[PDB]
């Protein structure tokens, strides 16, 4: 009951990003997911999950672009389409054609019938979700976005799933199941099943090559006019 | 003199910006030019010529991409090329063809020129240099970028000089030719010419109508790809 989880209310902004949210449902961040800042988010993500700055500054000066504050978030602010926030996710809906906020479990079963018959999501399971996500996006919806911005997001987005909730050596590219499970359904770190935080620290170099290794088994092709443009700002 | 001018030492970092290089020569902001975050910039900006915090905001957390700091930059970090930075610029050299970060007069004599007869730079000659610029750079430069938003970028920076340089009164959209001249050359405030801080805030719903007529008369059309992605970290 140092960081305790406590499920979010109604007091509490809560975004796309299960990382986030998880941190502030832990007390890392503040729990009413308000007035969160990039030096706070490094912090919250070296104690949460071993994540270290070089990574937490670049997304999180991105992250920043969502607000209109000089230099602090709410977490739902991440929700803007077209900064981070993409079509495609792995347990969002695409703004589009739905909700791109919450967690949706018609979505995130995708993920959770990957790798049939073992018990840990990989690089490989994490490949083929992310290209049956995608031709679900193209088949459904008129306006998708895939950029190669997107679609690098979008790995390191699974490269961390499998990184921060490893069982004991990130560098393997998987984690159980049950872990990754809880960590998108209830945005809780999963410690009463067994999960720790990870004794290796979570790199810009550890995670390249994951992303690049995931990038290229998910038979991977830009749409529309690949152009790579965000939102600066909301 | 609570902030006076000094010139910047071999040490004192400076970018392409003059609005805030000149700033950081008065005292405004650090006159090192170091270790600067978005809070810094809305105060000084406020201070120094009335300009509020939504422009600065806005501006400010795109410029902080280009450090790998948390929540800071050196001026000098605003040169990287294609976050803000672009080609085309008032009095810089393109990045592809020369030096995109010092004050360069023979660029500059495009402005220095226009307005023929004239004391002033207002909204139509800004937008007759732009043009100008343009031109300058589809002719000399064969890796010139320019876009929606690099032109977007450049009526704004118009806007900037056009405003807080003038003559008291920014919605008029014009600047003694003596005052934007100083500010460029020299980035200082041109006190002992007769200029001061303006007593009309400045402000986005200020500026926009002025980018809006500097677009609208520069006969503008883009280049290849014509896509908008900027350069999200160093
Ligand atoms: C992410 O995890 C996935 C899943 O764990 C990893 O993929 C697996 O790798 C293991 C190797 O570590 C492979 O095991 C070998 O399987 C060989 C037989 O493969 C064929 O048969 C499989 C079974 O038949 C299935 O049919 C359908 C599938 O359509 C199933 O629904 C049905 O229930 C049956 O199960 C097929 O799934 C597969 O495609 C092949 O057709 C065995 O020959 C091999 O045995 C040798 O090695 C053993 C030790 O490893 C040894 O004890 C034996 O004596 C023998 O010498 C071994 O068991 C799995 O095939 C493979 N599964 C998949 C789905 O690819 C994946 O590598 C990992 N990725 C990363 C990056 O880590
Ligand atoms: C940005 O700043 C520029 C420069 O100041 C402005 O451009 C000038 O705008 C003024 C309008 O205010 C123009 O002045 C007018 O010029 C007309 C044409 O002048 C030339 O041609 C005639 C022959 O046809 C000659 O007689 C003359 O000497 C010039 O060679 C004149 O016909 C107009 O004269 C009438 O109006 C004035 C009062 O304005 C009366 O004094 C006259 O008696 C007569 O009734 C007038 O002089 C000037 O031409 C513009 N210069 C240029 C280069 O375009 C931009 O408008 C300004 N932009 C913005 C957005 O503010
Ligand atoms: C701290 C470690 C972090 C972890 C483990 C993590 C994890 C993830 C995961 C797995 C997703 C994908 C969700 C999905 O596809 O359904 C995601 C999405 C997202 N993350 Fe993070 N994240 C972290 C940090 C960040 C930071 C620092 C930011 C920005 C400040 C950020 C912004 C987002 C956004 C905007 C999305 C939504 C993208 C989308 O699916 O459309 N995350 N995050
Ligand atoms: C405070 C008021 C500001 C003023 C009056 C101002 C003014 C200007 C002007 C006139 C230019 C054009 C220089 C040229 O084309 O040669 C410029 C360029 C630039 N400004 Fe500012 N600016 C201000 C604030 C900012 C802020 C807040 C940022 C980012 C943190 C910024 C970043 C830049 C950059 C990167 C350039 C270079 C663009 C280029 O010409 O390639 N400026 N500024
Ligand atoms: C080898 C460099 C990769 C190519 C350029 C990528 C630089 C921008 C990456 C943006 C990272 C944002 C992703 C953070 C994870 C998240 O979204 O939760
Ligand atoms: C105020 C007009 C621009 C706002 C339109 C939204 C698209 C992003 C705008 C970027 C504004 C950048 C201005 C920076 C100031 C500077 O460059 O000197
Ligand atoms: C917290 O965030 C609110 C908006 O959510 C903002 O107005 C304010 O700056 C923040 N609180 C502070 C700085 O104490
Ligand atoms: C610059 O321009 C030429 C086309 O004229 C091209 O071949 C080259 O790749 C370009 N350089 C860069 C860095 O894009
Ligand atoms: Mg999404
Ligand atoms: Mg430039």
């Known amino acids: ?10 007091n509490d902004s809560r975004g796309p990003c299960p990382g986030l949210n998880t941190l502030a449902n832990h007390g890392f961040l503040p729990r009413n997911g308000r007035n969160i800042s ?4 490094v912090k919250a993500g070296f104690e949460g999950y071993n994540v ?14 969502t607000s209109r504050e000089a230099d602090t978030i709410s977490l739902e602010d991440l929700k803007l389409h077209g900064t981070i926030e993409h079509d ?15 967690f949706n479990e018609a979505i995130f079963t995708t993920l959770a019938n ?8 990989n690089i490989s399971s994490a490949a083929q979700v992310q ?12 306006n998708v976005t895939n950029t190669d911005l997107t679609a690098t997001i979008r790995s390191s987005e699974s490269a961390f799933f499998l ?7 990130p560098l393997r590219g998987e984690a159980p199941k049950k872990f990754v499970n809880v960590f998108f359904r209830e945005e809780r770190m999963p410690i009463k099943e067994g999960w720790k935080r990870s004794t290796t620290p979570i790199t ?6 994951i992303i690049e290794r995931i990038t290229e088994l998910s038979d991977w092709k830009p749409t529309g006019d690949n152009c790579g443009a965000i939102v600066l700002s909301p």
Do not use: C, F
């Open 1 to 10: 009951s140092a960081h305790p989880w406590k499920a979010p209310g109604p």
């Open 38 to 41: 990039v030096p706070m988010i």
């Open 52 to 65: 270290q700055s070089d990574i937490l500054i670049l997304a999180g000066k991105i992250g920043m672009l």
């Open 88 to 102: 495609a996710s792995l347990s969002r809906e695409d703004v589009a054609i739905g909700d791109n906020l919450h």
């Open 114 to 121: 990957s790798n049939p018959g073992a018990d840990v999501y």
């Open 131 to 142: 290209h049956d996500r995608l031709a679900d996006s193209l088949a459904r919806n008129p």
């Open 163 to 169: 990184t921060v909730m490893s069982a004991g050596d």
């Open 204 to 209: 810009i170099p550890l995670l390249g090559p």
